[PDB]
């Protein structure tokens, strides 16, 4: 029953999942549908209702790219928080030494974040602000460097990942496998984590066989996606460092600075 427990922990811990996202993306969000953000005007219109207007410590008159940065990084901070609670529900994770728990989360969270982000993306754009905004892919590309270069590789990954047509039961196991990865630099109990990995990967393999009998090669496809994600994160981290060094008004949250530091 490991597959069911992990799926249950996923539904319990993440505010957004693919069922909830496709409901909004299909135009069925009756009360509070998403604000469509496709230019500077509709960005400002959306921010009027979706972001609090502080008096001094405010993002109101910062550059548009920086306002989007702050919204995106705050969502990531919450997803990291949710991923930590999710990891604790993975059987065996809580008995690891604390430093190994940190290392797994340190290197895993952004691979999981960009995997799960695919669920709120389609070819035209992505949900933001807890399902209450939809920002177009073209608008993001129209911004100035280096901010216009951040999301495009994530949209590219998401298009091919979404083409596999996974559901939340699949994704929950995939994210657990990302987290319980015996390959991370500086891990201590390598052998035990490799066995946790093997156990979760095994449950994933069996689950894909039951859930996707039409694609008997789905599992190696997903192994390749894990390697794609690790490369996607290493390249993303380089963009993050550029912004941390050269963008004065883009103050990185201390939790994200800790995650990216020495990664």
């Amino acid at each position: 029953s490991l597959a069911k427990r992990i799926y249950e922990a996923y539904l319990k811990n993440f505010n957004m999942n693919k069922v909830k996202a496709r409901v909004i993306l299909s135009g069925k969000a009756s009360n509070n549908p998403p604000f469509v953000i496709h230019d500077m005007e509709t960005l400002c219109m959306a921010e009027k209702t979706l972001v609090a207007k502080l008096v001094a410590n405010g993002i109101q008159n910062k550059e548009a790219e920086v306002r989007i940065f702050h919204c995106c990084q705050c969502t990531s901070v919450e997803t990291v928080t949710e991923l930590t609670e999710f990891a604790k529900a993975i059987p065996g994770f809580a008995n690891l030494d604390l430093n190994d728990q940190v290392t797994l989360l340190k290197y895993g969270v952004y691979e999981a974040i960009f995997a799960m982000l695919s669920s709120v993306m389609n070819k035209d754009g992505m949900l933001v602000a807890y399902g209450n905004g939809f920002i177009t892919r073209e608008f993001l590309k129209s911004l100035r460097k280096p901010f216009c270069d951040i999301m495009e590789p994530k949209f590219d990954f998401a298009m091919k990942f979404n083409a596999l047509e996974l559901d939340d039961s699949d994704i929950s196991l995939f994210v657990a496998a990302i987290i319980c990865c015996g390959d991370r630099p500086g891990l201590l109990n390598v052998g035990h984590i490799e066995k946790m990995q093997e156990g979760i990967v095994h449950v994933l393999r069996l689950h894909l066989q039951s859930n996707h009998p039409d694609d008997i090669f789905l599992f190696p496809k997903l192994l390749q996606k894990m390697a794609d994600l690790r490369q996607l994160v290493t390249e993303h981290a380089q963009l993050v460092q550029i912004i941390k060094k050269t963008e004065s008004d883009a103050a990185l949250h201390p939790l994200l600075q800790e995650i990216y530091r020495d990664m």
Binding site: V80, T84, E85, K88, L98, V102, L105, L255
Partner: peptide, 11 residues
């Protein structure tokens, strides 16, 4: 006491 450790040390 790092921030990730704080998250992990939660109840």
């Amino acid at each position: 006491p790092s921030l990730l450790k704080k998250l992990l040390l939660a109840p």
